[PDB]
Design a protein around this ligand. Structure first.
Ligand code: T34
Ligand code: K
Ligand code: K
Ligand code: ZN
Length: 401
């Protein structure tokens, strides 16, 4: 079974932010327009039996004072009057400003992604679904007591925490395909060997958030019993589908071989697309040159490990829907063994006119340092296996590269 998180109130809240607008409605309505909904099990977002239960769930990672401050920010933005000087200082102390401003539903919006991804984790734990999709989640930059990068609450960290705590041990592999380094998730599990994190991303001087690269400098990779358990691959601008695919393919396969995870969690932020306004990487959604995203998801799904697939960044809304619709169809095919035939032309539906002027499913695009990174990462995986007394065939993993 393949699940997907949605609901009427969930759709309203996911569409209530100034930054991401109606993106989630475009995504779900294109998936619906291509007749994929009957193939999928709807997973309802989690709701709680009291305010105390909600706080207990969110403060599994975030501090109570931060949660209090985020709730107060919503209240204040639901009244006409501006903040007092003391209220400005309070919000500033949690970085609730600049990139992460207040707006009238900021807390309900943020909490909704948590509700969706916690329900997705439970559906995997109870074996109701083999894979669950939540295009409303993936907010990987939020920290314990700090908003960052328009991420206010880290739904990813909370989902992973539910997975590892459900248990000769439970291990989670987190794979972050976003253009940006997944710093919040990496930091949350910096001391935990049972959650291995792996982010591929652009990094360069001054580019957000600044981490996930050399810090002569060296790569940090975890601490305490979590030493060697945070993996990173920073890539230069301009990379295309094939080179990005060859860059991460052998790493993914070797992480699966050595770690043998009980669950996989993928963040699939779409800001790597060639047509995203960042204009950094040159990936596509093409499906025969094969989309880097579809190559990676197909490989991860070939492992037959229960898998959570989340959204994230993506600032060209119709092209993000074009990508995530193909990811959704691919998941159905690999998991159910049931061919999905997607028309090359956008079907008529409520947002049809947003896909102009062409109305094609394909996005509108004309398509040595990596080897040193591979050597470094393979040594780190060996060190991780040594330290955690894991059994693995060094010859077979070396061949992968
Ligand atoms: C600052 C910033 C931080 C994080 C992200 C992001 O996608 N993180 O995954 C994205 C941005 N900015 C993207 C952007 C910039 C200008 C206009 C619209 C989007
Ligand atoms: K990433
Ligand atoms: K870790
Ligand atoms: Zn991003």
């Amino acid at each position: 079974s393949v699940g997907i998180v949605y609901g009427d109130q969930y759709r309203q809240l996911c569409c209530s932010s100034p930054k991401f607008g109606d993106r989630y409605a475009l995504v779900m309505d294109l998936i619906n327009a291509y007749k994929l909904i009957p193939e999928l099990s709807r997973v309802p977002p989690l709701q709680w039996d009291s305010p105390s239960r909600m706080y207990e769930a969110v403060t599994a990672f975030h501090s109570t004072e931060y949660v209090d401050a985020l709730k107060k920010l919503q209240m204040l933005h639901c009244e006409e009057k501006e903040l007092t000087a003391d209220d400005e200082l309070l919000m500033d102390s949690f970085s609730l400003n600049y990139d992460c401003p207040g707006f009238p539903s900021v807390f309900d919006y943020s909490l909704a992604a948590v509700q969706g991804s916690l329900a997705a984790a439970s559906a995997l734990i109870c074996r109701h679904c083999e894979v669950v999709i939540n295009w409303g989640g993936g907010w990987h930059h939020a920290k314990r007591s700090e908003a960052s990068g328009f991420c206010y609450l880290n739904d990813i960290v909370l989902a992973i925490h539910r997975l590892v705590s459900s248990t000769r041990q439970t291990r989670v592999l987190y794979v972050d395909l976003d253009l940006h380094h997944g710093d919040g998730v990496e930091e949350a599990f910096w001391y935990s060997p049972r959650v291995v994190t792996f982010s591929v991303h652009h990094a360069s001087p001054g580019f957000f958030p600044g981490t996930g690269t050399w810090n002569l400098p060296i790569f940090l990779n975890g601490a305490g019993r979590g030493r060697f358990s945070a993996f990173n691959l920073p890539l230069e601008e301009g990379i295309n589908d094939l080179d990005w695919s060859n860059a991460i393919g052998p790493i993914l396969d070797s992480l699966n071989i050595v770690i043998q995870p009980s669950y996989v969690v993928v963040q699939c932020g779409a800001d790597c697309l060639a047509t995203d306004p960042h204009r950094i990487f040159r990936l596509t959604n093409f499906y025969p040159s094969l989309s880097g995203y579809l190559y990676a998801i197909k490989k991860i799904l070939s492992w037959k490990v229960p898998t959570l697939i989340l959204g994230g960044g993506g600032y060209n809304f119709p092209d993000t829907a074009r990508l995530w619709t193909r990811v959704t169809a691919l998941t159905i095919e690999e998991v159910k063994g049931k061919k999905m035939t997607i028309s090359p032309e956008i079907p008529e539906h409520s947002y049809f006119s947003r896909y102009g002027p062409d109305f094609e499913l394909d996005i509108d695009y004309f398509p040595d340092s990596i080897q040193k990174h591979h050597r470094r990462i393979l040594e780190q995986l060996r060190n991780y296996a040594d330290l955690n007394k894991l059994i693995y065939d060094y010859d077979q993993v070396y061949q992968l590269y």
